[PDB]
Amino acid sequence: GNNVVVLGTQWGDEGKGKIVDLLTERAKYVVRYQGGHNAGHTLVINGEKTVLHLIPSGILRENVTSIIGNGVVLSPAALMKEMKELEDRGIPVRERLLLSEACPLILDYHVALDNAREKARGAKAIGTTGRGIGPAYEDKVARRGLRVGDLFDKETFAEKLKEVMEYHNFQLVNYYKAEAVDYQKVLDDTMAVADILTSMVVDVSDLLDQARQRGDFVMFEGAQGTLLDIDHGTYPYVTSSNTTAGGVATGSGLGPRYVDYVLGILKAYSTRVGAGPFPTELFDETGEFLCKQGNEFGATTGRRRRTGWLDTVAVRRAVQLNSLSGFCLTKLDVLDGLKEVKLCVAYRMPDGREVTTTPLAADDWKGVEPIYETMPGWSESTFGVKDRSGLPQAALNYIKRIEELTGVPIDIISTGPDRTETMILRDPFDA
């Protein structure tokens, strides 16, 4: 179809950046519709390595318009830093990047709440919560937060700000016993960029509607894993926003019936970062092997992610929630050399009952036994292969099986970090 959605179908880290980058070469628009400054996309800005957490990689492409829909919470501090880093590198950001007037603003006190909460709520251990995303979403639903559009009328901005801050400072001092955030500073910091921020504001919904009508290629990229969905993920080990493809309408303004193709980035094996149920998890040699061959490390205070086999049950849930059109399998090569490969085909419940659906209504994941299916592995490398013929039969059978168990075709296969190492069996846009 023409409106393409690309998201992670598991618990994050599916390896979606390369796919996103490759699909941006044919797209007219790239739209972020959820999350905040946590996109995590590492790019090579002419020899120099750089990560982008807010601005879409489509920004590097000359004929592409990068859009930040109302679903993304925007820290002005974060955008300016990225804008400057990019413009410093020759990229004319301010003319390829558009924002919604409805984006919720993340200010100092928002981050302050997070920092405060992690101390008490969590503990003195890897408590990386410095961001302020959640609090921004919270103020949004409580109808007490600020939006980019509010910057258009300064007088009111200041009044609105003042009120939300006294409310927040109260909690900071009298409940968390943290410092208060200074009002004048927030106001001055924000007013300092108000004209920049609102100069990039556009009527996003109408814009996208015009593109749809003209048949332009529009790519919607999700930043977090499907199973981290606040609503359908594994509560409470979920993020502050909806991550499923259904979040595209709300977070961008485009109607639901306009999603043509939903590309689900699927990793060959599974990983999880932190607490949460993970039935296929491996606590042995094979695990350690996936972690090593896959380089499943943080790249920042990395404690080394949890590994395990591909969970077909877990993936069936994501097919449902996202109405997946096809998969893009990644890291197939990471498995190169395993005498045998496993894939969970069902969960066995404590009572004996076997299921193809993931746990609901309490009766938690606490005791699901994974029913695996053992496949022989392959020795012949799959790294770099650019055609289904370079792929050994074993590799093919495995892929073949995933398709059968899910009922969704693997339309793209990734076999290396570079863009040339990619197999396209269908193509999201022209099909």
Add this chain to the structure above:
Amino acid sequence: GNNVVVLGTQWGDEGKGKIVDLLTERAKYVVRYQGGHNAGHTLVINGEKTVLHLIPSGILRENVTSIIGNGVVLSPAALMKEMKELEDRGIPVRERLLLSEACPLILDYHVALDNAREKARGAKAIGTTGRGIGPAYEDKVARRGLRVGDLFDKETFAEKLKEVMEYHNFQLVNYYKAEAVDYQKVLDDTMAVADILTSMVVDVSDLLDQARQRGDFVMFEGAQGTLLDIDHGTYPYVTSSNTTAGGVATGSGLGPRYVDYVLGILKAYSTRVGAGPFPTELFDETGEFLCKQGNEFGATTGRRRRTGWLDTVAVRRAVQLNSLSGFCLTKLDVLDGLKEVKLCVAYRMPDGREVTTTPLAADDWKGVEPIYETMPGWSESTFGVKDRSGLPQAALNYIKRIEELTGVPIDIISTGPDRTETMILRDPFDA
């Protein structure tokens, strides 16, 4: 299509109850996916007139199953009230109703927070003092709240309740200087009906997928007006949750691509309750005529029910947001007797530009002048008419200009309050 979404396209009060009752004769499943206990649907049963704000109207039907999706914030109190009302009028609710374990719970403290907030700074203003929908949504986003699914583990429920009730009581007492909320009571109030609740629990998205395979008729029911959507409405004069068709996916777990038809309920003229932009508002005898002849005097639900001409510029935004498939024009009869009739086709901006798209959700709305296209009216009666030949050439001309300005057909036309006072040109289910 088998999956039908139905909602009002303006600021509510579009006359959708009748349509929903109608469409409910073919629906196998009727689902609520957004908001809370502010969805007023009036009905007659044991000769008495009963109003439901939570339970789906389809509860009257026998071979229909009603479902409250995870998108609805649920108040046990309000669920027991309606439940009992129906049990009393001989309807086996326990049998026909189903609920998501992911529905956030609304407890007394949430109502306290809401009430404290508006019955405070700026008493005579616009904020809260009511149902407690925003606080429950907020707890959900902060991830500190309780879900229907917590009722299974009664032990964990009681301590969880204590941790969160401690957090709000502090707020209530110290910041609002208000009565705290007795924990023992809330705990006792929820235990009293926990078992009742957990029995109605089901995996909703798994259930909606099976229905989708066997071809069952699923009607998704919207509760508020489209232009009141938290994100895309006439902010700040907005409601608590999302009101556009975008929430069916996040709100029920149904994949976005599986929505077949979106029916937008559309009143033949405009109304709005309370504060807020309203470009086509009347300040002459006509606005008084449309109110009196339309029974809009704080009748169905109001207090400040302003009246005006239909706004195609606003209606087009509604088309855009919901991917409208077809319109159902309601209260055609109200315009019976008018000399002329008007439609807003463009907004003149205070500067001077004449636009056709909704100005940004924060611009000179109170300062925008609507451009109208006038049309001859009809002395003949439309009321009661049950066949489009029986409608006057003037009427079936107005009908066509709406079609032509919105670019969406009107598949159903309501000519009076009786169920039989309806014309179904197409039927969302067969389309």
